[PDB]
Amino acid sequence: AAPIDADKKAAIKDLLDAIDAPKLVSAIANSAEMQSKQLVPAILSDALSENKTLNDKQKQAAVPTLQKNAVPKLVDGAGKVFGTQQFTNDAMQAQYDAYAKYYSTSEIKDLTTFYKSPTGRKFIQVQDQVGRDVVNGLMQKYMPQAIKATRDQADKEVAAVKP
Amino acid sequence: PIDADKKAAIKDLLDAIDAPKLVSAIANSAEMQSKQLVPAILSDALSENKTLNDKQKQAAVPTLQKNAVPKLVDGAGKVFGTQQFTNDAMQAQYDAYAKYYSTSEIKDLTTFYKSPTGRKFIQVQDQVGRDVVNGLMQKYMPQAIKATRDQADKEVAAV
Ligand SMILES: [Ca+2]
């Protein structure tokens, strides 16, 4: 985390405006919040395993109600930190620092020119869609075949167990 | 169906972005994902087996864990190393570029990607994104986990 000289900072500020950097921060916050919500079951499991008052029969019996009440409540409250102004500010500073680290001032200015051009503005809107179309299309054609190949061999391994 | 002038403009674009390196990274990513799915697929197959009773299934887990998992893992995701996958991934790149971009936009992109700043961009832009996400993750992941953990501790104690 280094000091950005004045002319480089002003160039990055113009680049961040041209790529709509706040929209990108918003997507990072929403993705982290989602990741936090997906960790709730594992964190609740850890709190149950490490709780120091309940015996092992009471813990095993508490699972049904914790699954029904605690998980929805924890999911609802998870990742609040990602909606704060502090997070947004920090993600903005992180964008400045990342651009200053990998690009020179003159490269940042070239980038801004491309992003403000008509084809650059198009690129900002569709280029992610281009990546998703490629990956999702190949996934649809090939993920089933790879799963089935492993599953069919897995059937043979289980059928081979001799008890 | 892509007209010839757009097809030839896309061919030049893909050379300028080193499209085969992007295909190779997609294939490797898919292969790794196939291998990481092996324990879940083997549990499906053990669960669905109709010859072993449930005590025999539990007793089989140690040797399945030890022999079947390394075997299935070395064999998972072979389809992603075939020439047919590469061919389909190239074709998917043509289709995607043709669908969202016009011929003159394709030519503008090539000019940008062939410029010195375009080539730097091909080289570091993914690293820019990872640095942003990883720095924030280092700072905020622990705070988010602690927030959920402390509320989970109160939920467990209130049982
Ligand atoms: Ca024209």
Ligand 1 center to residue B22 CA distance, Å? 29
Determine contact, residues B147/A74, Cβ cutoff 8 Å. no
Give the residue carrying structure tokens 């002319």.
A7
CA terminus-to-terminus distance, chain A: 60
Reading the block at residue A46, the tokens are: 């850890």
- Burial of A123: CB neighbours in 10 Å, binned 0-12, 13-18, 19+: buried
CA terminus-to-terminus distance, chain B: 63
Determine contact, residues B155/A66, Cβ cutoff 8 Å. yes
Domain range for A51 is: 1-163
Determine contact, residues A106/A63, Cβ cutoff 8 Å. no
Please indicate whether, in this complex, the C-beta atoms of A155 and B49 are within 8 angstroms of each other. Answer: yes
Shortest Cα distance, chain A CAs vs residue B5, angstroms:
18
Residue B100 amino acid letter: Y
**Helix boundaries (H) for chain B:** 4-16, 19-36, 38-48, 54-63, 69-75, 83-100, 103-114, 116-157
Resolution (A): 2.2
Determine contact, residues A107/B93, Cβ cutoff 8 Å. no
- Classify the C-alpha dihedral A133-A134-A140-A143 as positive or negative: negative
Please indicate whether, in this complex, the C-beta atoms of B155 and A47 are within 8 angstroms of each other. Answer: yes
Contact list in B for residue A147 (CB cut-off 8 A) is: 34, 37, 41
Ramachandran class of A5: left when φ > 0, alpha when ψ lies in -120 to 50, beta otherwise? beta
What secondary structure, in 3-state letters, does A10-61 show?
Answer: HHHHHHHHHCCHHHHHHHHHHHHHHHHHHHHHHHHHHHHHHCCCCCHHHHHH
The number of CA neighbours under 13 Å toward the Cβ of B148 is 31
Determine contact, residues A131/B95, Cβ cutoff 8 Å. no
Structure-solving method: X-ray
Contact list in A for residue B104 (CB cut-off 8 A) is: 119
Quote the CA–CA distance of B9 and B98 in Å, as a whole number.
Answer: 10
Residue in A10, A26, A1 with CA at minimum distance from that of residue A101: A1
Which of A73, A101, A142 is the mutation pick for testing B, counting most B CBs within 10 A? A142
Total number of domains in chain A: 1
Quote the CA–CA distance of B31 and B37 in Å, as a whole number.
Answer: 10
Please indicate whether, in this complex, the C-beta atoms of A94 and B135 are within 8 angstroms of each other. Answer: yes
Shortest Cα distance, chain B CAs vs residue A11, angstroms:
15
Please indicate whether, in this complex, the C-beta atoms of A138 and B41 are within 8 angstroms of each other. Answer: no
Name, in order, each residue with C-beta under 8 angstroms of A71's C-beta and a sequence gap of 6 or more: A40, A41, A44
Please indicate whether, in this complex, the C-beta atoms of A54 and B96 are within 8 angstroms of each other. Answer: no
Residue in A24, A92, A29 with CA at minimum distance from that of residue B140: A29
Name, in order, each residue with C-beta under 8 angstroms of B4's C-beta and a sequence gap of 6 or more: none
Ligand 1 center to residue B104 CA distance, Å? 6
Which of A138, A148, A162 is the mutation pick for testing B, counting most B CBs within 10 A? A138
Q: How distant, in Å, are the alpha carbons of A90, B16, B40, B89 from that of A134?
A: 33, 18, 26, 7
For residue B122, the Cα-to-chain-centroid distance in whole angstroms is 19
Quote the CA–CA distance of A133 and A114 in Å, as a whole number.
Answer: 24
**Ion ligand 1 residue ranges (Cβ < 5 Å):** B 104
Quote the CA–CA distance of B9 and B78 in Å, as a whole number.
Answer: 33
Determine contact, residues B69/B38, Cβ cutoff 8 Å. yes
Quote the CA–CA distance of A139 and A142 in Å, as a whole number.
Answer: 5
Burial B105-131 (b: 16+ CB within 10 A, else e): bbbbbbebbeeebbebbbebeeebeeb
Ligand 1 center to residue B96 CA distance, Å? 20
